[PDB]
Amino acid sequence: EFSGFLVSFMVDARGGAMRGCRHNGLRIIIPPRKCTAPTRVTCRLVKRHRLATMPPMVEGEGLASRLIEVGPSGAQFLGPVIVEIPHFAALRGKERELVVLRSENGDSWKEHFCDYGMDEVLDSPEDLEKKRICRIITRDFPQYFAVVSRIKQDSNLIGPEGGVLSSTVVPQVQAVFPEGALTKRIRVGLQAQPMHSELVKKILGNKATFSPIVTLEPRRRKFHKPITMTIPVPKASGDAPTLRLLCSITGGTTPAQWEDITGTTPLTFVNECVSFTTNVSARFWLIDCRQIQESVTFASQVYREIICVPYMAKFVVFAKSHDPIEARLRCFCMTDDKVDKTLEQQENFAEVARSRDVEVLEGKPIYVDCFGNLVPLTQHHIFSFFAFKENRLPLFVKVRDTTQEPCGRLSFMKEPHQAICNLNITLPIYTEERLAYIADHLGFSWTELARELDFTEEQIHQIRIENPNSLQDQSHALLKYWLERDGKHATDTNLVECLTKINRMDIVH
Secondary structure, rough: OOOOOEEEEEOOOOOOEOOOOOOOOOOOOOOOOOOOOOEEEEEEEEEOOOOOOOOOOOOOEEEEOOOOEEOOOOOOEEEEEEEEEOOOOOOOOOOOEEEEEEEEOOOOOOOOOOOOOOOOOOHHHHHHHOOHHHHHHEEEEEOOEEEEEEEEEEEEEEEEOOOEEOOOOOOOOOOOOOOOHHHHHEEEEEEEEEEOHHHHHHHOOEEEEEEEEEEEOOOOEEEEEEEEEEEEEOOOOOOOOOOEEEEEEEOOOOOOOOOOOOHOOOOOEOOOOOEEEEEOOOOOEEEEOOOHHHHHHHHHHHHHOOOOOEEEEEEEEEEEOOOOOOOEEEEEEEEOOOOHHHHHHHOOOEEEEEEEOOOEEEOEEEEEEEEEEEEEEOOEEEEOOOOOOEEEEEEEEOOOOOOOOEEEEEEEEEOOOOOOOOEEEEEEOOOOOHHHHHHHHHHHHHHHHHHHHOOHHHHHHHHHHHHOHHHHHHHHHHHHHHHOOOOOOOHHHHHHHHHHHHHOOHHHH
C-alpha cells in the first residue's frame, strides 16, 4: 500500500529538517517560526501502482514520481515550507516541465500554487535539474501531491478583449485571439513539442520532416471568432508543394487522430513561419514529405513514438549459476526510486551489472541480446518498460567456451543501431508426490508461481491449452514441467521462496 515512513519527525517554532531514509534526495524542511505547537511531519510514497483516483492525465503526460503523502494532511504553516522529491522524468532541457498537483481528500485533483535562518543548503536550479529533485514549496499539506511530467505549457487568462499566447520553448509558435473570440475570461494553454531529427529519421528515414507539435488547450472548444496560429515550417522546408498542415481535434484522454486539412486551410508564409486560422482549439502539426498522400500515415507512426513519456531508468542484472554450463539471468529495467523491494528480493542471485540512469520510453519494448562467451538458450528476448513498476526479463544462458572465463555482454535496444545501454557481465560459479499435494492447493496461484519460476507467458498459455478448465490439472502440469526443466536444482527452498512471494504462506505449511 505504502512505502515505509521515509520521513517522520517532530517540529515546532524552532523549525527542523530531515532527509528520507531510502532515496537520500527526499527531504523536508520546516523553517523556524512556521508553527507554534509541536507537529509530527511525515512523508511516504504511495507504492500501489494506483489508488482509487489517479490524477487525470492526457497523451504525453505521466507521473514523474509516485504519489507523495506528506502528513499530517491538512496541516498549515505560518509561511512556506519545503518538500523535496526525487523524480524520474527526463525533461529534455526546457521541452518538458514538472507540474505539481494536489488532492485534499484523496478524491479530486487540482494544480498546486504557492507564492513566495537555517543551517540547511538548498541546491541551485541547475543542481536540482541535475539531480532530478522536484522542490515543492507550500504553506500547507494536502492528502496527496502528484508530480506530473508534461510538455512545457505557456498559459494566460484571455477574455473578450483578446490577447496573444506565445510559446517560451519555440518563440515563433503563437496563437492570437482577436477581440470577440471569447465571451468570457478563460485560461488558455499553449504547448509546442519540438522534433528531434535523430528519432524521426530512425522512424521514417528521410521520408518526412516535421514542425513542432502545437497544442492549444483546453482542446476541442469552439471560438466565436477565428484564432490565428503561427508555426515554424519543418526542417529545410518552406513554401513548397510537399508541405501539409495536419490537425487532430480529439479531446480529453482519447488518442490523437491526425487529418490533412491543407486543402481547406489557407496558409500565409512570413519569416519562415506559416500562419493560418482555426475556429476550434486542437493539435496542429506541419509535415513536409515527398509522398503527400502518405502524410497521415507518416505522422501517425512518428506520433505514436514521440508522445510516450521519457523516463530515466537503470538496467540491473542478477545472475545465478544453475550448474557448470548453465546460468540464469534476471534483467530489470526500473525507475530507481527505492520503493520496490526488487533489488533485495533476489535471494540466491548475485547482482552482476548495473547501468547509469538512461532514458527509456514509457510502455515501449526493449530487446535484449547476449554476446561474447555467453549464449542465450533460444525468436527474440523482449520485455517492456513501465515507470514505477517491476519490469523483468528472465534469460537462460550457457557458457560458449568453457576454456574461458564465464563472461559476456548484454545489449539493451529499442529495436531488433546504437543501443540504450551495454553491460559487461561475469557470472557467479557453480559448486514428487509432495509436489502433487502442493499443486492441489495452488488454485489461481499457479500462474503467479510460474512467473516467479521464470516461465514465459507463452508457456503459461501452453499449460492452459493442455489442461483445459482445471486449476488443479494446470497446477500439476506446471510443477511437472518445473521438475523437468530444472532437474536437481528444484528443491523446496526455491518453491518456499516463490510461494512466500505470491502470498501463499498457507501452503508453506
